């Protein structure tokens, strides 16, 4: 359905490219070049086709004047030069004569990087609120647009929807996998589909549950959000976090979709919120009054893993316990391993917390798809039509 960069006539064209260069900084030093590594194939491909590259990205959150200096894109242009073993031209303006002239001087294969798109947010939040003038102005600097930034696809900015309204628009190779796999879940899934939901808050996951409940055969629930559901079933949960205003939603979900919903059968509890606390492993029916459910138990890890067998798609969104603590990490590790182990199934990670956990665990290569867009991937799963995607042309 969507136009991809490899569908365009690029040669001799000035190609505007929205790339995700929002990389981790420290004193203005790149601590993790991974978003740059990943942006590479779209760029290298446009170089091969003899395009003239003009790159746009945002970097951090620009609220006031003193935020600018640590959020310049100069360090990205320099890193991108090393990676490309070719010099990227960096212009430290978001518009004007010097920018315009440098764009015109580009020959085929040349790569230029425009300063932080969120410098435009200082006077009027123009980038972030998609000012009509800014989108049109940026679009007028080139012949075609490639949006390779899934991470901002759920939001309407000058740097995505803005440029897209003025120019033929295609997905980059990165944007395209996110559409293929995440969009695939919602539009034409490889059934059976199993969703694993985690994290601390029921709240955060209510909309994904309402959409996924008619697509998935099973919704597996762990992490802190699970204890509310247990409570909804009449169990005591101790001092585990509870969202009382989400009990009716839980009770009714269980009534409408009973066995579809798979919950923990044991839990690791502790009296104190600390990696050094005495942990005890109990059945779900014997959570102590003074204790807090901080990880799923070993029987649950096993049960959750068994519940995957036969699935042709698994979507995972959320840690199974307090993953930040070594001794409460096993539940997430175990479920992560089960999904990476599962043969003949598309396996998808949505959510920043799950993506980081899997990556730090050694598992990046063992999942069919680990999304690059924390907030975006979830909204996409919720069945929202992301504005950055709507604005890419169909093929």
From Swiss-Prot:
Pathway: Carbohydrate degradation; glycolysis; pyruvate from D-glyceraldehyde 3-phosphate: step 2/5
Catalytic activity: (2R)-3-phosphoglycerate + ATP = (2R)-3-phospho-glyceroyl phosphate + ADP
PROSITE patterns recorded: PGLYCERATE_KINASE (PS00111)
InterPro entries recorded: Phosphoglycerate_kinase, Phosphoglycerate_kinase_CS, Phosphoglycerate_kinase_N, Phosphoglycerate_kinase_sf
Top enzyme category: transferase
GO cellular component, one term: cytosol
A Pfam family that the UniProt record links to this protein: PGK
EC number(s) on file: 2.7.2.3
GO molecular function, one term: ATP binding
Main location: cytoplasm
Superkingdom of source: Bacteria
Entry binding sites for substrate: 20-22, 35, 58-61, 118, 155
Record: residues binding ATP: 205, 293, 324, 351-354
Entry keywords, A to Z: ATP-binding, Cytoplasm, Glycolysis, Kinase, Nucleotide-binding, Transferase
Example of a GO biological process term: glycolytic process
Subcellular compartments: Cytoplasm
Family membership noted in the UniProt record: Belongs to the phosphoglycerate kinase family.
Subunit structure: Monomer.
Full protein name: Phosphoglycerate kinase
Encoding gene (name): pgk
């Amino acid at each position: 359905a969507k136009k991809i960069v490899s569908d365009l006539d690029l040669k001799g064209k000035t190609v505007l490219v929205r790339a995700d260069f929002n990389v981790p900084l420290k004193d203005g030093e790149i601590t993790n070049d991974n978003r740059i590594v990943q942006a590479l194939p779209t760029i290298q491909y446009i170089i091969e086709q003899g395009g003239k590259i003009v790159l746009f990205s945002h970097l951090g959150k620009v609220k006031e004047e003193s935020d600018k200096a640590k959020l310049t894109l100069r360090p990205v242009a320099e890193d991108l030069s090393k990676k490309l073993d070719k010099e990227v031209v960096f212009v430290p303006e978001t518009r004007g004569e010097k920018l315009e002239a440098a764009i015109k001087d580009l020959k085929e294969g040349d790569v230029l990087l425009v300063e932080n798109t969120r410098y435009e947010d200082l006077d009027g939040k123009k980038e972030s609120k998609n000012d009509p003038e800014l989108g049109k102005y940026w679009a007028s600097l080139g012949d075609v647009f490639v949006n390779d930034a899934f991470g901002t696809a759920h939001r309407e900015h000058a740097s995505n929807v803005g440029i897209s309204t003025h120019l033929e628009t295609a997905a980059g190779f990165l944007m395209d996998k996110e559409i293929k796999f995440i969009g695939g879940v919602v539009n034409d899934p490889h059934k059976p589909v199993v969703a694993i939901l985690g994290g601390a808050k029921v709240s955060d996951k209510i909309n994904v549950i309402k959409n996924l409940v008619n697509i998935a055969d099973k919704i597996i629930i762990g992490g802190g959000m699970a204890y509310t559901f247990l409570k909804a079933q009449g169990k005591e949960i101790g001092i585990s976090l509870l969202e009382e205003d989400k009990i009716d939603f839980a009770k009714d979900l269980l009534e409408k979709h009973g066995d579809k919903i798979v919950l923990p059968v044991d839990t690791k509890v502790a009296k104190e919120f600390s990696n050094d606390a005495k942990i005890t492993v109990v059945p779900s029916d014997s959570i102590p009054a003074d204790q807090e459910g901080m990880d799923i138990g070993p029987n649950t890890v096993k049960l959750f893993a068994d519940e995957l067998e036969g699935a042709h798609t698994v979507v995972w969104n959320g840690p199974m316990g307090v993953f930040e603590f070594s001794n409460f990490a096993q539940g997430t590790i175990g479920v992560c391993k089960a999904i990476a182990n599962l043969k003949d199934a598309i396996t998808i990670i949505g959510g920043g917390d799950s993506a980081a956990a899997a990556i730090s665990l050694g598992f990046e290569n063992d999942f069919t798809h680990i999304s690059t867009g924390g907030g975006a991937s979830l909204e996409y799963l919720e069945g929202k039509e992301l504005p950055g995607i709507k604005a890419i042309n169909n093929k």
